[PDB]
Symmetry: D2
């Protein structure tokens, strides 16, 4: 049972708008909106949305497998060895937010300070002492973006596994000789970094020039979560404010996915006439190019919605009914909707491109969608005994070598419950980089944006005040 | 009574190394080491130091006044108007860590997200609604370092006040016409940004080509805190590990200041022979150029200690007794002392150049000295009733317009207790940028590095584990 | 009769290797190698070649028309107006080496100092006084590559004409309103600069993703000049030195074009067995990425000649029989062939990418192919009376208003003999930028590289010594 | 007899404005204006001047010796060895325009294409074969400004000699061990590049913070050429156009030098009242920061001429009588004087900063002052037999080993007549980089700007038309 199975289960449930039932529904962690910084919903004038893995959650592991398979085939068609075709996507290996080190070919799970929490070369997990040969301080400078690539999105799950597959394959195939920084086969040297670049290239290609989109759109029920409660939440948002879409995808893919997401024999609730997806938005903007969108952006263009092509020239007109924008910048949205940043709640899944950058560059309020949180919550409650235990050993240790080895033993047993790369949010008692960025930049977060439906629209989301150590 | 008065009071006290007295001395917040992240002192192999405002704490307000007066005189000598000479430094105005906005000429106190906490144009404090003309979202992008200058060090206290003085002067002198971005006097236009640059230039000049150093060294007792407990702590550090100095100052100024700091008729404790300051360090490095020091650094040079000049050429030799280094990089220290970053506790006062950058670029452990914390602690306890009260109003509000105006009333009354720009760490219930960077990058912090003397050298500094909202 | 008609006429002639006939053949300017700097052919160890418009000269105007037509269709398919389809390529308009000014939408012919020789907005030729509104000093800074694009290659001939077509079309179509920097149609503004970028984009697309290559290769006799004397010259070069190919084109296109260029029922001369084109080269390198090739280059790869794909990884082996390289740099050629720059004669048509950059960055000897020189020579002799006349008027003027207007009259009449944009090399008595770069960077130049066949291979090409004015 | 001796001889001669005497005076090459491109003097509306080595020609070798001696002393005071004090400036060694190679420590004389004409390591002249170890192609990429420094100005003459001195000293002093890229003395390594940087630093320091200016101004007759014909030429220029000064020097040095240059008991001619130097200029601009001046420039400031300090703020007013500008840009001059670039004749000595950059960036007409041309002309006529001979050997060679060795023999004998580094303009029959830049960017050139006095102010300076090889 995958995380998208939990989300699809909640999606099949109709909305009971009885206020008592609503309060009791955000009872369960699965349906709750979690709060990092207080947010007064009556001060929110505009609700903005990302599409992919926000409004349109791709089913797991079917969609990752599709991307993995088409990426492998692209690599084989440009000349990678045939044995790649016998790989098969395995969802229990990759955790999101890992760092690939293009120098040594390792996948790393790190904390906010770049300390190593897990190191895996292929499928071989390097333990503390052996990592010191390559990482003398058990630390990487995360901001060295020329060496380290952070696999931040659910789109990166297939290549996370594929990178491990490839390193494992070349390490153990006798045609190749392993070196510190890559593999040699006679007079051809393949560095982990050029191997990495071919994988990124092939993933991009499959999304943009290959057949991934076509195969998605040809079987949307297999690949995309559908929820009748989405029209309801959007129409309620429109009753108190403005609603906009700002997505990196192009207009033709956006129209196909969105049409499907609203494809019900009714509108906002059963019994009402169905309405086109565009009628739920005061502003629709595609080809956003986030995060650049939150700085200088690009030239504001206008989509010809009959053809799906951009009209020629820069659009200099006003907001008008029916218009669909391409490019522009976050200032386009503020001007056209008459909003200041703190009036805006932007809802997305990209911790960097949607959340970090809109917060830091523009002062937008932020809501981070974490689709895996559905399952992570299940594991966290179910095996809370393991963590509760672990908490106590570190306090026993505070007040010796026999303790530490069981610290490492239950850390391992706790982490294995999530997958081979452990929880998205921690390794034992150590929080990941990803968890720390959630806390720092996501004002609100939840397994699904739909959890906002279970809150009255004047609700004050409350977080506790932070105190420095000396202020306690 | 200034913050340096508190530190000078503690400095006059001899050390009682009775273990029971030591534990009871770190009783008081003034003498405590505060913990953001746990640190096991037995794992620390090297203790490293900054000099200025770390080992050598300049007395306040005498030293700020000296810098203010010499900066004003430099500005007048290059042609600023004579009325500047009637300014006098006023320590109750500036709080450290303010942002000067070179576009509109405002001093701003902001939180970690660049939201405005205080806005002052000259000595005129702009309240919420009027700030929206210039800051529509009550927010600045802190990383726009071309527009915003963060006044992060105690060296910036005089220019913080001077900037306010100048803006106030030109605003109210009838020879000048105020515009949005500066002042015009006939055919000469002075922008706030070029005004700002002249102030930075003049401060630099006074430190490097003017008479500030000479006047400091000519009356060290007037300007520099001296503490007989410093030799004692350093010699105890040398018993368990290595000790190094890495300072941006040059060798001649370093030798004059350090000689004074050790100028007692005894060595580590009363009764012992006095020893030169250099004997307390396994490695001495000047002209460090931090934070560049924590990246590529500069060429490693060797000081000729008889002349105070650099020897010609790059030093390629080994660490040897008596040698004094200039330039180099943090890797110089790791190689020469045989250390990894997490073996090192670096002790300094520059939140960016000493602490943030050594943590992020190198994984060093960090100890931040905050000299004002002496007084900030006094105010915080004394008027805790105000804050305790404020805490309760926000909870009353959580469960209306009459409440909010008293929220703003006690925020004001609390803040005025610290100075006109409020506490270094907060404005009411909102933490400053500076406070948030302390928590994020300073593993330990204290009013003085000397507070380490009151802890056994196997002490485990303990911080509580962090939990995400959904993990609670 | 086009310039490629002259070249095709000379190509149909078999070689008479009788030494007396050879000397009398380089009699005629059409068959001569012209000398800017002396070059001793016995000191040349390596002859290197470009392919497109050097070994493979595309027939004019058929090939330009094909490129024009496919570029127009691409523009229409992305949304430019239908009227574009009624354009037809006109070879009498464009001269090579014009500068497009993306700010004002003008085609400009300039001298070496950026002085205006001709200015055309669409098909409207702006005369001196009116150009001063937009060019106050009748001058452009050529190196402002963000504003000015120099149309340096014969590949740019179709877009040179197309740019003029488009500006003319939008200027005179009543649906659009002309502004200084572009055209507006209601709420869409098209700047000349974005119009320019769409044209560049469409030309690139047609060459790399469209059908230009396919349609070329499907009718090579229609589009490519073929000359039985090419195998002969290459085999003679191989008798005294080494021969290499370094081309920006990929391997599959290179193999198709080169196979055709050698497709004769004989080898070097009639009666000899035919040999594959690859046997004429000691080193074959594709995907050169010149001019970057003459600096850092790119990673050296190896072509799989059976599949036309690159082998995976960097090629680290030696030069070996049969190998085909991709990428690398000019140093690859020097190392693998054991050559220094002055040992190398590089033969190409790109005045910047082949000639200027190999000379300045590497000290290579250079031979510039100028296909239009065939016709330019014909016009220059035929109407030498006009130029001879013009020469005399400027001397009459040296020793008044009545003279100047006839100066401008015969300048016009001379220039019209070449085309609407005049000679490649001059406008009246003023040399173009292009002519000055030929003289400065092309050691040798000729209508065709084949003219080297008419010179013994110890020939000393001789240029006169240059004297400064004061040395005369 | 130095080149400044020739100029001082011509300067002592009073002006005979008899038109017949004027024509017969520009008879002699010493007094002629040489023409690279035709220039019609009646089209010149503004004459602009540089000061140093243009209006104010420093006497040779006295001034170079002064700069050499103060530079050596600065190097010794920062720690270079005492033996430097026994160096003495030797004017027969350095020729202007040499390239210092910071990697290998060689002085190089190169042509326009970066081919080696002379290579000297210290005082050791490397002949052809041995240079190939370090320069395999006998060529340098001149534009690699990180490795190569071109010593373009007469200010660089002392450091040209000093660099050779130092390399020679360290090579032959037994305390130091020579390596490929520098010198080692135990544990200190001095690279030629850091040695080079210390020399540049010391030259800058001596001009800007040392005592060079003071010692110049204290004995102007010893150091500066004075010519009573300068007021006369400037006043005649003012009769037909506008005159401006644009100099990099500051106002106080400019006023001292200019006052001296006009210090005669008369004005423009004997018998007329003396006038202040400022009255000869319609526009005076100091701190020009050329060549940046010809691009974005700097902020336009106004000099307070009573104090010599800049007024505070940007000057936004109009041109007015008495005003002195600081900074700004070339556009300041065009706007304030109502001129277009081709209306302007700019007169200076810096081939890059004055001539190349004003021509290429702005289309100004250019007049290059070459003070050494006085002596170079003398040598060129006197020993024309050597060159005339050399010309004939290369023609004998064109139509063998015995010839070449005498080619090299007379090249050497010709070059030695100029100095150890040969003529500024050539080595034998090969023109230098400097000569080629004179021809390309200096429309006019002369030993002194004063030679313009011998031409009527409607004179058409005439250069011959350039023809490409195929046009002959
Ligand atoms: Mg998304
Ligand atoms: Mg400090
Ligand atoms: Mg070509
Ligand atoms: Mg000068």
């Amino acid at each position: 049972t995958s995380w998208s199975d939990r989300l699809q289960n909640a999606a099949d449930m109709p909305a009971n708008m009885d206020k008592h039932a609503l309060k009791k529904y955000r009872r369960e962690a699965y349906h709750r909106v979690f709060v990092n910084r207080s947010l007064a919903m009556e001060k929110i004038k505009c609700f903005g949305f990302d599409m992919d893995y926000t409004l349109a959650v791709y089913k797991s592991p079917e969609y990752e497998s599709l991307g993995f398979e088409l990426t492998v085939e692209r690599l084989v068609s440009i000349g990678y060895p045939q044995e790649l075709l016998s790989f098969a996507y395995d969802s229990t290996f990759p955790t999101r937010g890992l760092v690939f080190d293009t120098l040594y070919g390792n996948l790393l799970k790190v904390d906010a300070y770049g300390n190593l929490l897990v190191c895996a070369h292929g499928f071989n997990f390097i333990r503390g002492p052996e990592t010191r040969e390559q990482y003398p301080n058990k630390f990487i400078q995360r901001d060295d973006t020329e060496r380290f690539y952070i696999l931040n999105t659910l789109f990166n799950l297939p290549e996370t596994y594929l990178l491990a597959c490839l390193v494992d394959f070349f390490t153990n195939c006798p045609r190749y000789t392993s070196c510190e920084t890559g593999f040699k086969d006679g007079d051809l040297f393949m560095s982990y970094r050029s191997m990495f670049q071919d994988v990124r290239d092939a993933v991009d290609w499959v999304h943009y020039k290959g057949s991934l989109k076509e195969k998605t759109v040809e079987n949307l029920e297999k690949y995309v979560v559908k929820d009748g409660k989405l029209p309801l939440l959007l129409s309620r948002m429109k009753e108190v404010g403005k609603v906009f879409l700002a997505t990196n995808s192009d207009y033709k893919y956006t129209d196909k996915i969105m049409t499907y997401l609203f494809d019900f024999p009714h509108g906002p609730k059963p019994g009402s006439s169905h309405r086109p997806w565009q009628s739920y938005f005061d502003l629709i903007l595609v080809d956003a190019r986030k995060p650049l969108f939150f700085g200088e952006g690009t030239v504001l263009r206008q989509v010809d919605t009959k053809t799906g092509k951009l009209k020629i020239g820069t659009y200099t007109g006003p907001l008008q009914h029916g218009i669909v924008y391409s490019g522009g910048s976050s200032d386009t949205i503020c001007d056209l909707l008459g909003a200041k940043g703190k009036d805006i709640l932007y809802i997305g899944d990209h911790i960097f491109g949607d959340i970090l950058k809109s917060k830091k560059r523009q002062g937008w309020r932020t809501f981070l969608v974490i689709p895996e949180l559905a399952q992570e919550l299940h594991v966290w409650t179910d095996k809370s005994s393991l963590f509760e235990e672990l908490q106590s050993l570190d306090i026993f240790l505070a007040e010796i070598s026999s303790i530490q080895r069981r610290i490492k033993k239950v850390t391992h047993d706790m982490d294995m419950c999530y997958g081979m790369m452990g929880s998205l949010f921690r390794s034992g008692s150590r929080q990941t980089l990803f968890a720390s960025q959630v806390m720092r930049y996501a004002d609100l977060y939840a397994a699904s944006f739909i959890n906002l439906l279970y809150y009255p629209f004047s609700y004050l989301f409350r977080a506790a005040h932070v105190l420095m150590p000396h202020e306690s």
